[PDB]
């Protein structure tokens, strides 16, 4: 069955300022991911060329509870549009072995983002 996972958007979390909690999401195809802003001023958006081929781009409105359906297997890098430069990202691993994860780790992106992205990848390891 399809499960729903809740992800929160916070000004301050345990890992720092401007975060997605959790920042790492393990899901199966057909799962929904619900993005919930706790504080005002956050949204969720897929980052260009950081979702698997076949997946559709999306961008939520600020403060709305966004329901994302993941169909394609692989890795999804998401961001909060206004705080992406501050490291506000979340990774969604749908299925096993996202082949595009390598491509997501190497893609050009803010240095503070790379730090968080790597750290979540190591913790999931
Ligand atoms: Cu934000």
UniProtKB/Swiss-Prot annotation:
It comes from the Bacteria. Binds 1 copper ion per subunit. It is found in: Periplasm. One of its GO terms (cellular component) is periplasmic space. Its cofactor is Cu cation. Its main location: periplasm. The keyword Ribosomal protein does not apply. Keywords: Copper, Electron transport, Metal-binding, Periplasm, Signal, Transport. Induction: Under anaerobic growth conditions and by nitrite. Cu cation binds at residues 42, 80, 83, 88. Residues 7-95 form the Plastocyanin-like domain. One of its GO terms (molecular function) is copper ion binding. This soluble electron transfer copper protein is required for the inactivation of copper-containing nitrite reductase in the presence of oxygen. Serves as a direct electron donor to the nitrite reductase. This is Pseudoazurin. The chain holds residues 24 to 146 of 146 of the full protein.
